[PDB]
Amino acid sequence: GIEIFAALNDFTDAIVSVPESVCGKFTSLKEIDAQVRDIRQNVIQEIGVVLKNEKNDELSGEERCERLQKTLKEILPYSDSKICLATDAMNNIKSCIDRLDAGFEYVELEIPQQLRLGYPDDRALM
Amino acid sequence: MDVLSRVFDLNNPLTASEFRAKKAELEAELESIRNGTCKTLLDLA
Amino acid sequence: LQALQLVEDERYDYDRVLNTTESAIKILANFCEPTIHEHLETALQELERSKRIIKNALIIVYGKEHANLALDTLFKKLPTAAPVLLKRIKTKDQEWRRSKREWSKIWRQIEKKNAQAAFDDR
Amino acid sequence: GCVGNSSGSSIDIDYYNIGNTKRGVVSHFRRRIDPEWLDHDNPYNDINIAEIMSPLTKPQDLLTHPAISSIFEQNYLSILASSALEIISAEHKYTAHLEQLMVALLGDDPSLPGPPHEVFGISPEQCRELTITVQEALEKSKEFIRCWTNVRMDLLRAIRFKNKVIAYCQGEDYNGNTQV
Amino acid sequence: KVSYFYDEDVGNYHYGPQHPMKPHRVRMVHNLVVNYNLYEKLNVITPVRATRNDMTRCHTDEYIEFLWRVTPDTMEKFQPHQLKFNVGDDCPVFDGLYEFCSISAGGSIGAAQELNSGNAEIAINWAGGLHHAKKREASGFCYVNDIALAALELLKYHQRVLYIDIDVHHGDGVEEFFYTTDRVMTCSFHKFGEYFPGTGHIKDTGIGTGKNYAVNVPLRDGIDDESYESVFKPVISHIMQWFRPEAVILQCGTDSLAGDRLGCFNLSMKGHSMCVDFVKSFNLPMICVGGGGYTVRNVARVWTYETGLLAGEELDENLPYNDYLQYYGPDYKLNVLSNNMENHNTRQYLDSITSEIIENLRN
Amino acid sequence: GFGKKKVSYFYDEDVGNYHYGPQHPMKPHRVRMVHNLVVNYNLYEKLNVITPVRATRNDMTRCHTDEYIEFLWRVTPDTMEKFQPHQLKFNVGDDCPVFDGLYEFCSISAGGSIGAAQELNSGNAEIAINWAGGLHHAKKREASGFCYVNDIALAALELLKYHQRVLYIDIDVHHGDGVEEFFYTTDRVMTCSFHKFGEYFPGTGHIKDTGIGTGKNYAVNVPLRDGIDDESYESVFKPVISHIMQWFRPEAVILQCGTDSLAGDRLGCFNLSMKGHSMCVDFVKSFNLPMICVGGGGYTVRNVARVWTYETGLLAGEELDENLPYNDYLQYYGPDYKLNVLSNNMENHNTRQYLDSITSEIIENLRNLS
Amino acid sequence: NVPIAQNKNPSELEFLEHARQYLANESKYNEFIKLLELYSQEVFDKNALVERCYVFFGSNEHLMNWLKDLVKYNPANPIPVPRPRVDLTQCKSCGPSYRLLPKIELLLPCSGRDDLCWTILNDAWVSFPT
Amino acid sequence: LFDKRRIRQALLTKIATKCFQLLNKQKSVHDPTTMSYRQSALLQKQRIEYEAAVLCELNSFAGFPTAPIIETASFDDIRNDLLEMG
Ligand SMILES: [K+]
Ligand SMILES: [K+]
Ligand SMILES: [K+]
Ligand SMILES: [K+]
Ligand SMILES: [Zn+2]
Ligand SMILES: [Zn+2]
């Protein structure tokens, strides 16, 4: 008979649920990401001077790498934090999006054709 | 050539020892390729 | 002005609860795995350092009487008490988040109307 | 000493048990029919609960219903997706350099045929420690990217579905734009 | 190069069921500092929790030890001793009280130590600055008085400190701490009359060798930006002329804004930030702490603005999407306005008190 | 150790052998010619020449439609008597003929472009060349104007996995309409095209075509007139691009280097020379961004061969001698036998005030940006 | 064809009813229904439906031949014969050169796009020489 | 030389992701957590429709309803949990 839109009424709840998990996680990231940028620029400059070997030649290659080694040792505990946060966010959004997808699979079925394919005359078809 | 098409081609849970065994296998394979003795590296090479 | 203040107090009270259950979910789900029986004296040390978050999660989900009971019983029978707590707390979290969505549907209208009509202390 | 009195006798709550759950209520602004109280004394006047919480029943209602339309006018996904791209890009600028150093240290560098410890003079016992730490760093930095990319791609899936629905429930008012 | 202290735990404490004081507000501030990309322009530090030997230079050891041992579920043996220390009704006992007190006092002492050693000129501790707590009892939402400890730390190197207070309530704990000394001068701008704490009379200006070295500016209801400016700039200017401070502790309570829960002023974000501007413009070592503030949306926005302006930046007017965004509807802007509340300060009154003050300050 | 960075350079030895039609202006043969000079200037010692991995169906339908790619992959010049509906639908048959090895040609082009994108994504290079690519007139649903599969879109998509903003500069004499239509409603790719706007193909590109939706102010058109010279072109080119680099702030550039905008071309109607044309490439390169440089138009093959050779030697950081060394096509390059293309005495139509007007307008539009 | 929404032609009704109980999984039963919908509105042809159906009815050889006999499939000529072309003269415009596309035109399959091509690439506005 | 380095890099990444994915899959399958989509959808719609009527009635008669209360678990469920933990 006449159809309630149960799926279309759950879709609007899923579409709201999606941003919140990742909202918390995004901010927690931006903190870490912002307390690591100087070290990352250090590492980039160091790798550049070690890999060109001809453009900034002021070093003793044995020490030019001890510096890079120490700097890499400094950045290591931040990568773990980033990995934990990324896995948390991944799981949360995965569940939420499975829900939203299962919904949209149905909201496209109980909607009249003329509302998604237009009237059979508003189609150019030369 | 065509590397990406040759290098590229479970909810049942695991006990503690099966998990440890599988993990040890994967770590050993990683260390195998990091020094150039893998059996998938050598065939393509 | 007081209707707006009540809106703000209500959403604050939702937030503190949701945040507490979140952190406790995190820790407990960390304590649930296959290899947990192996390295237990390390997990048993990350539980003493977080006893307060889990105590508050229990106070919220059970009550101030069963809280001590569950805290002790988990201090002993850890690698099989942790999963049932995790299941309960996740169910509660899901339903409370679902509730907060549908009431935020209404807090917004309250704030619109009274934010307009509340800048008149004459 | 009494800093103040925060709780006035207007927000006091009364609990009523319905079915199996008790619901509190603000009962100072009831109908309390009397001469002194006017309608516009009620803060919660003209807040219709029956039409805020009501279902849709008609697809086009998505664009006029108060609460729902206030929901399809937020752009919180389009902010988050761009934030994800901005986060991935810096990490990748770092990973590319780590990766170049890695192919140099392993030895699979076309432009470096000799032994790597020679081409930047260091003891062959220093090159192994360097290679170990570079390997850890590169692997972790690759994993973070692999996860954050899935986060971002699912945000994009959500955005795609949302726009598709906004365009379906517009019938003949479909001008290409779908910014509500 | 502004030291900015922030401990992540302080936003997880909870005074009581419907209490007006929420430390959570501090967390909201940080959540806008990060999303405003001010994290990179500030030297962000994590305070070293204050020990028990640090906290009993002002307070007594008996009161501090009581604070240490008490606990919300084992206060059946303390319940007699509760109200001997004013704890219990509006200074409740909650879970983790001593941790919160150590966090705030440690932030303040850390800021003072940053300024002592030249590592900065401006320090910020938004989760300290509790000016009501007395030497032997709690008082009006505050248990340990961190500002006295910050000043006792500053006085090791500097020679004369100035404590400015723009919380609508009177700063009675601090004033009573340094009431008989000339090396610290207290200045308060407070609503007077039938109000908490009921001290702060325009004739209370210190004893002993502290005579003339306190300043109470008793205002009245409804005051707004222009009148506040007209009475704030003259007195501050004459204090800097005649006292010659070396360090400035600025207390930035925000219950003096329009719409507060327990406030009776009519300032706005511009009217409030004018005071920070004007005190910063003297180029001094400046600690800048928090205080009151009980409508938390206002507190968050105003304190974010004042931090962005103490660093030197210019934050947008719109608000960046963050976790606590919906607290700020339905406009979502960094602005706090004022209402048509009727002022009660006749110009003659303001000029009379200003002249009495300045004539006191000539000694 | 890993030393300097060299220029990757994609070439597939079969690419020269595909032949459109009897008197068709487009000759893939020309790429062969370019290579025969890159070999005989001994340039190949400063490049990294790479063979492209031909692209598949599941790689070309990231932009086009299943029906179009299916028709491409199935048709042959003999069995096109059964495809007469598809010819009408897909715009194939007169200007875009069906020939032998059509699909293989398209796969070579698209594979070079995607390979260049992967090279930049990986960090192995900072410049990457592919002269067989750059077919900028192909739509998502159709073929249009000598092009069948729009590989610049595929390169851009592959670039957008790690770079947040991309800039596509187009200096073929025509309007790059496929690459504009693809990215018209988005603010992650900004297109900028300089072209002859008039009674000219394709007919689009009006100065007030600057994007819809979110891509409002993220397309740039510069409509010029006949006979423009090197100094007029430079006057209108350098300001626009300077402000795009200032205000848009990209992270990766795709430079289309068509050469029917040269003096004496079979179809174009401009008046640039080899140095005037190379000025653009050198200016764009001077900004130090990851860059792709693709082919494009060009229907006088001697001029095209010499110019693309010069620009290749100029991206590599070299300086080529102006005498042509003996190569297999020396008799195409008479009678000077020099590495140079010369302008003529045709009359310019772009008065100074016109150029000032459009430059001002465009710079206001770009000031709308962030 | 199968041009009515959900009701006609007892043959098709029985075939649809029996199409489950093997495809009993609904999540991959709605997909087949949507493809039938696309076929009946003239996006596909009888030759282009059969291939995705092969994806669904590979093994159950009884159903597949029923299907082929239901759309009058001919194995003599399997070329797919696409949908005719639209004339953008009678379309809403935005600027000198762009036109808006009918709603149905956005329902052509592009089976390589992930959810980055779908949000970045432009789908609705085409270009028309003014 | 090109293809050799390409293969090595690709294999390195593939094996590392396999390792991480195994770790996560174990942790998540050990995590403890109907009849359709239609059923849960209809359940939620019926429940919302009931709550709306309850709250409109309570609105007219008694007052304006505040946020839903945050309560503990049932007596039965607390019992069963203390049991299985015991
Ligand atoms: K004093
Ligand atoms: K004061
Ligand atoms: K052009
Ligand atoms: K664009
Ligand atoms: Zn106060
Ligand atoms: Zn051209």
Residue numbers in the entry:
A (entry chain H): 5 to 130
B (entry chain G): 1 to 9, 19 to 54
C (entry chain B): 548 to 669
D (entry chain F): 49 to 228
E (entry chain D): 7 to 369
F (entry chain C): 2 to 371
G (entry chain A): 503 to 632
H (entry chain E): 394 to 426, 432 to 484
Give the article text.
The highly conserved, multidomain-containing protein Sin3 is thought to provide a platform for the assembly of HDACs and non-catalytic subunits, forming two major types of the SIN3/HDAC complexes (SIN3L and SIN3S). The histone deacetylase Clr6 belongs to the zinc-dependent class I HDAC family, which serves as the catalytic subunits of multiple transcriptional regulatory complexes, such as SIN3, NuRD, CoREST, SMRT/NCoR and MiDAC.
We sought to purify the endogenous SIN3/HDAC complexes from S. pombe by employing a C-terminal Flag-tag on the Sin3 homolog Pst1, Pst2, or Pst3. In the structure of SIN3L, Pst1, and Pst3 combined with two copies of the histone deacetylase Clr6 (Clr6 and Clr6’), as well as two copies of the WD40 domain-containing protein Prw1 (Prw1 and Prw1’), and also Dep1, Sds3, Rxt2, Png2, and Rxt3 to form an intricate and asymmetric ‘Large’ scaffold. The scaffold, formed by two coiled-coil domains from the Sds3/Dep1 (CC1) and the Rxt2/Png2 (CC2), bridges the Pst1 Lobe and the Pst3 Lobe. In addition, the hydrophobic pocket of the Pst3_PAH3 associates with Rxt2_α1, while that of Pst1_PAH3 is occupied by its own N-terminal loop. The Pst1 Lobe presents an extended appearance with the active site of Clr6 exposed to the exterior space; however, the Pst3 Lobe is in a compact state with the active site of Clr6’ buried inside and blocked by the Rxt2_NTD. The Rxt2_NTD is unambiguously resolved in the EM density map and stabilized by the following structural features: the α1 and β1–2 of Rxt2 are anchored in the Pst3 Lobe by the Pst3_PAH3 or the Dep1_α3, respectively; the Rxt2_loop1 is further stabilized by the Rxt3. Notably, the Rxt2_loop1 is inserted into the pocket of the active site with the residue Val51 stacked against the residues Phe147, Phe202, and Leu268 of Clr6 (inset). In SIN3L, the CC1 of the scaffold binds to the surface of Clr6, and the CC2 directly connects Clr6 and Clr6’ to form an asymmetric dimer.
